[PDB]
Design a binder for this molecule. Structure first.
Ligand code: SF4
Ligand code: SF4
Ligand code: SF3
Ligand code: SF3
Ligand code: F3S
Ligand code: F3S
Ligand SMILES: [Cl-]
Ligand SMILES: [Cl-]
Ligand SMILES: [Mg+2]
Ligand SMILES: [Mg+2]
Lengths: 263, 581, 581, 262
């Protein structure tokens, strides 16, 4: 049984979403790559470089035109004619558009591809722009977070393969399954919020008992993600559980909503 | 065409030009060009960072307490190291001292990162330069088992296991969907492992891809998540409670038990899988002990890392030594000072940035990040680079130098520095390693050497992880639970104007953040990162950086298949997002 | 002393009396007494349950919806199976049909339990009767690796691994703190493995102890926790949401992924570790294919289990066949009806209970649990038993019979029933297994056979786990998400007076709960559990139960060291808390 | 040398021993091989009958005053104690002999702590918790049915590492894991606060993870770590899988009315 072809491209990014993907505990990234999909192009992991990598790219998007999923990590910069991000000597945006033209659907991994993320924070030196402002004629699934949760990434992939359909999305294009509710709506410290039991300074007695981080700047009340339920790294923790407020990292523009430590 | 001499090399751009763009199996975006002579030997090498984001610009005007979170997103591969450098820089500026447990935990975070990052680089990034994956399909599973059992006590070595791995590979490839193996260099004459060693390596590639996810559970416990864990100015946010009500809301005995279990498994994997594999790659590729030396016999740099005495960044505290060697004089390891304006400086005469005077180097406290895409004549157009012009501006990477010298940073650099300072564990480890390969000490100064030192360091770090955990537990047994200092959390407590330097040794080398705070906000934030050093373009003297030097003089078997270029570049573990930030 | 004949045995209590109290490496409290003749052959065997709690009394007056939680605490070893029987019984009483996914998930819970329980029994409970742990210290690690590799593709077989396991044991025993190994039977002449096989088995003991914790993650996903997961009358409480807002609050794709990953790992361990170990024990202990037969060549019973058609408990639906064989006539598998008062009955003439007439058996719908501690004329006193009096009351276990026949239940019983009904998978598996041992089919009817069938069933159950998971996913792909039927949740909707039977095949055999509901409350709740069958005391005819029969005619090498008694008893996997409830 | 531990079993279902072997960190293997000396344990020991009685006697004599005694289950006072018989005598005699030599006692589970299911009405056997029989020794109560596997192992590692008993509340439960209620750290609390409740099984509320209070959840009165530490290597806990807390770590939880009534 042929595996679904996936082309994974990288714009301006820090590679955290690729790193998150390989952290997947179930299915293991190994098993995704060997058994679930055909990861046919991926700068971070592929053997071929340079002209050989260009040949793979061109062959896959031609042979599987209309039939591959395009995964995009990072974003294109509009500044300097696009030459803030160069691939094969030309603007990354050209490779994005060419890849997007042949895709059946596009997964925008991370807050970078979804919204802009850190490079788009004020004053956005490069005019970094999210994928959906450039590609306007394809289904785009936004999977935001900096990075998204590893097992969320793999669960979205498995859903698409198993059910042969895209996940249903909210009005922003985020999968309902993992972005339908706020962090604060499933936070295990909510009892403390409800009771006015707050950490007021780091490592105070409240902090040592797991009191709410709202007065420390937690953005859980405005942030949609699965961190408080599905959690991180095979359920080991999430930001709040280890004592830091949510930064709001799955939400558009989160770097520019004031200090992480103001409420 | 032109020719000039620098650092013992003859830089000559006559002859055929080869381009490798994109460089894959790195983090981020890189382009490499070389010229080769009629004997297919590289006579010119050109390192180009093909991305920029501008974190130094974005950081202006931010709250210094928030800075770590921004700069952490410089890179998701070396995730955490920029946050560590940031909190160090901000604490140095303001005058904050953290509690001992915060320092210990920070050292745990960094050691965990070294283990994880070095492991993934060895297999997932560099490994396919050395292991011919397709040739694994020709191996005999019993002979593979025999080989593995000769090299290691690792349990997973049965003939059936190797047959199952081989069969998985066979089924994967059979339908033509080769994925990440498509259009590789398989069969190239520089692949020297026997088929059994290729099957062993490939099995390990898979085992490492799985296992790596477990190592970062330590970052999840202390830092909430990986990638991109959380930190604070003043210590760490992961408050500890062992024996009081509400320990369920804090780092408690069960959470510490989890960390210990990960540490043991991480040491076992490194010591019994990665280490023997690195030695085996060495045994079958000894000629690469003489290829890719570059600057590693001339100039190497370490800032040092892992302060064992909390808030003391001096020589007696740092567990990983700092120092500089220049002119090949390894008998005189020189002291480094990151405030001295005559030491670290960055040039941009060959980079896409503006300075008022591009013939001079700027220390980071006088640093300027004013992007200027100006490739000049590149045989194409501004949006179509056919050939970079290395006589002018050719990279998004600034050119750092130390006292005007071009330096190599990273595992090989650090190993050389520690060896030549007389660190006993390092001397013993390097001597035993080179003895086992029947190579002279000089064999480490090479592309093979970079890989060997990287494995050595992973083993070193796994041992230090236990040491740090034991130090944490000792404090907890003595009733010392503190994880944060908050005396200077509020901006009303800070100097109106101050500046600070945060430094460490990231997996790829010497990292520094220079920050200036004014009126409660970041006034300047400049980063010089290890791949900035290594991937550096040229300076006003035409001096070449570590990558360009290492590529010089290298024979290529097949010009159109750049395996030798990939081997050397991958040996440095390029992080291009880091380099450009 | 007396002597009488029953079921082809001569029960003779002359001769030396041996007592084994406590029986260890079982669940709960058991005492066993035997008489041996001058040839050290067992001529009398006495099975005594030495505990009682009275769940059937405690359940009176409870809400039927709560019953599953109470009866789940009958036992923590076969955890979940009493909850399953309970919900089946209450649903049968009230007239509730559950949705298909609830039934599939219940089947997953039971298959998961069979895998876990069988695995742990094989290594942690029975294993030390066959493996001489101390003799593992004499093995050669290479020869151990060679043995393991000849038997299995399991990866973990290196000489270094076996040397490390061996050194761990050596370190453990070096201080003279032998823990669970202290004062064992090591060196007994009935230990027949070579040292290499002992080291292999001991390594596997450790691997199984570690791995078993993973299997029950499936219980944690659908049932909240293990031990003692949660259930509901009407289906399961683990609501499913794959593709809608709020999936983070339900069984979603990530939770299902976790389940699939466990299922694959569980199958792999069972198939490549437990299976070849069971075969190896067989190969070195073939004489035990003729020891401990007991009732297994005469009378065997299964109710059947794993209804594949939701709410249909008939023959076409049950994936594990039901049926009864008596008189050694395996050509006539007879149908079992748990409502028929002439079929299942319990006797208490030799048990510590009161009936109005103790010479007759009571079907569970007429059951009575009125405890009466009355050991009569023991050697000793009623608080200091030296010798039970088996001519009168001698156990907390009631004596079930089927149409008046004494039956064996459990993996061997089921295997015989399925084999002789012509279940193709079972026929094939048994045939292949006995062929590999060069033993006739009759060799399963034995103590060795009980062990082999338990391993066979673990493999069967691991395969069924995948089958059930695939069915659940097929329903989800079709938009069929329902997990509970709640139209009869409220007591006002129930019949004023009704009764029901819930049955299944627990790891140890045929399980039934009989419940009567009146005016919204439990009016009667009677359990007959698999170790109640096997550990049964005698009936008014003097007929012996499965344990007492299996012990008959057994040679003992050393009367003071009851290794042969432990081997046979442990082969049935005794659950005494279950037996007495 | 490793700290000697004698583990005995009264009337019980063996759920606490099963829980213990589920430990993920440290693995039970490693606890047994490297952290303690598990010197008597009916469930796992090789020796049976007279050989098991010799181990018992040898250990409590040779290590008198120096072993930890773990107790699972409880003694029945009915029928002169012969609802639970060991070596032909009442279990309670073995409990008392073991307790007399112990340095400290761990009461694993709600059985040993409080009574659990056998003590529920009408308590046919007169099952009685350990602290009503043993009155002159430290008893650490570790309740739950069973307690969480990694809680059990964390308590053991604490005792070994820090060479001291955990600090306890006024009921003898370790503050570290029993200091707060389930409901004080429950991830569904937002829904409780909002009046967002499951009203019948598998309704739309249940499918979004709403609060189980109206389905009988006893989280608000139950002290344990299930909602934070969670179960089976953090995989789940009762509420996360859709069932209200039964209250299983609390004295008398079987007899507080239906599990499904508020
Ligand atoms: S910690 Fe953050 S998400 Fe949790 S209750 Fe407090 S504010 Fe809400
Ligand atoms: S589910 Fe139970 S414990 Fe959680 S908030 Fe609701 S009532 Fe409280
Ligand atoms: Fe870090 S790529 Fe993996 S979203 Fe925030 S940086 Fe972007
Ligand atoms: Fe773990 S033995 Fe199981 S019943 Fe409730 S604690 Fe008791
Ligand atoms: S910072 Fe991000 S990782 Fe989750 S808890 Fe907040 S959305
Ligand atoms: S039933 Fe018990 S297991 Fe925890 S969630 Fe409630 S205390
Ligand atoms: Cl954004
Ligand atoms: Cl109770
Ligand atoms: Mg910089
Ligand atoms: Mg009964």
């Amino acid at each position: 049984k042929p595996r679904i072809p996936v082309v994974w491209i990288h714009g301006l990014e820090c590679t955290c979403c690729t790193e998150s993907f390989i952290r997947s505990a179930h299915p293991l990234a190994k098993d995704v790559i060997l058994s679930l999909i055909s990861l046919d192009y991926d700068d971070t992991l592929m053997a071929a470089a340079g002209t050989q990598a260009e040949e793979v790219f061109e062959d896959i998007i031609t042979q599987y035109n209309g039939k591959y999923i395009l995964a995009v990590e990072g974003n294109p910069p509009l500044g300097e004619q696009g030459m803030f991000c160069i691939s094969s000597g030309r603007p990354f945006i050209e490779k994005l558009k060419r890849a997007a033209a042949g895709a059946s659907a596009i997964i925008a991994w991370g807050t970078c591809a979804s919204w802009g993320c850190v490079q788009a924070a004020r004053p956005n030196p490069t005019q970094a722009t999210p994928i959906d402002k450039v590609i306007t004629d394809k289904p785009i699934i936004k999977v935001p977070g900096c990075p998204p949760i590893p097992d969320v990434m793999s669960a979205i992939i498995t859903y698409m393969v198993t059910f042969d359909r895209l996940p249903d999305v909210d009005r922003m294009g985020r999968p309902l399954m993992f972005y339908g509710q706020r962090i604060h709506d499933k936070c295990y410290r909510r009892a403390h919020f409800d009771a006015g039991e707050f950490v007021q300074s780091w490592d105070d007695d409240a902090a040592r008992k797991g009191y709410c981080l709202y007065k420390m700047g937690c953005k859980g009340p405005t942030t949609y993600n699965a961190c408080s339920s599905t959690r991180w790294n095979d359920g080991v923790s999430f930001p709040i559980q280890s004592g830091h407020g949510c930064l709001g990292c799955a939400e558009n523009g989160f770097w520019d909503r004031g200090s992480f430590y103001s409420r | 065409s032109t020719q000039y001499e620098t650092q013992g090399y003859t830089i000559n751009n006559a002859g055929r030009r080869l381009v490798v763009d994109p460089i894959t199996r790195i983090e981020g975006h890189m382009r490499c060009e070389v010229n080769i002579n009629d004997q297919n030997v590289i006579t010119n090498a050109v390192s180009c960072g093909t991305m920029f984001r501008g974190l130094e610009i974005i950081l202006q005007g931010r709250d210094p307490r928030d800075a770590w979170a921004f700069v952490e997103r410089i890179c998701g591969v070396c995730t955490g190291v920029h946050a560590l450098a940031s909190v160090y820089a901000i604490e140095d500026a303001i005058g904050i001292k953290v509690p001992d447990n915060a320092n210990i935990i920070r050292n745990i975070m960094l050691a965990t990162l070294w283990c994880h990052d070095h492991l993934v680089h060895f297999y997932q990034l560099a490994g396919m330069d050395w292991i011919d994956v397709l040739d694994a399909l020709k191996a005999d599973p019993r002979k593979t088992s025999e080989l593995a059992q000769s090299l290691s006590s690792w349990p997973k070595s049965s003939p059936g296991y190797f047959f199952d791995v081989q069969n998985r590979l066979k089924k994967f490839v059979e339908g033509g969907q080769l994925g990440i193996f498509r259009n590789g260099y398989w069969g190239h004459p520089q692949y020297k492992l026997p088929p059994e060693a290729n099957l062993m390596g490939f099995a390990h590639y898979l085992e490492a891809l799985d296992f790596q996810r477990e190592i970062v559970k330590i970052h999840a416990v202390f830092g909430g998540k990986n990638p991109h864990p959380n930190w604070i100015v003043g210590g760490m946010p992961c408050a500890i409670n062992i024996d009081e009500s509400g320990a369920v809301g804090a780092v408690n005995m069960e959470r510490l038990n989890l960390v210990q279990s990960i540490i043991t498994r991480t040491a076992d994997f490194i010591n019994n899988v990665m280490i023997p594999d690195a030695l085996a790659i060495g045994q079958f590729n000894k000629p690469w002990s003489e290829i890719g030396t570059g600057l590693s016999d001339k100039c190497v740099l370490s800032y040092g890392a892992f302060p064992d005495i909390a808030n003391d960044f001096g020589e007696k505290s740092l567990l990983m030594p700092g120092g500089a060697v220049i002119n090949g004089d390894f008998n005189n390891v020189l002291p480094v000072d990151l405030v001295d304006p005559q030491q670290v400086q960055e040039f941009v005469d060959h980079a896409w940035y503006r300075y008022p005077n591009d013939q001079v180097g700027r220390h980071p406290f006088d640093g300027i990040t004013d992007p200027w895409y100006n490739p000049g004549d590149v045989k194409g157009s501004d949006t179509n680079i056919q050939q970079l012009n290395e006589q002018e501006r050719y990279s998004w990477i600034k050119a750092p130098r130390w006292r005007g010298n071009a330096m190599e940073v990273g595992p090989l650099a650090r190993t050389l520095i520690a060896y030549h300072k007389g660190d006993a564990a390092t001397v013993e480890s390097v001597d035993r390693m080179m003895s086992a390969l029947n190579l002279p000490l000089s064999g480490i100064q090479s592309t093979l050497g970079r890989i060997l030192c990287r494995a050595h360091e992973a083993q070193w770090a796994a041992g230090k992880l236990q040491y740090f955990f034991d130090k944490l537990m000792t404090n907890l047994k003595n009733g010392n639970l503190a994880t944060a200092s908050t005396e200077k959390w509020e901006p009303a407590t800070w100097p109106t104007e101050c500046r600070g330097v945060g430094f460490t040794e990231a997996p790829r080398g010497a990292l520094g953040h220079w920050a200036a705070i004014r009126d409660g906000k970041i006034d300047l934030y400049q980063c010089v990162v290890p791949t900035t050093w290594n991937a550096s373009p040229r300076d006003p003297k035409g001096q070449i950086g570590a990558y360009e030097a290492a590529l010089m003089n290298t024979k290529m078997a097949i010009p159109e298949q750049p395996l030798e270029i990939l081997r050397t570049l991958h040996s440095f573990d390029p992080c291009l997002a880091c380099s450009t930030h």
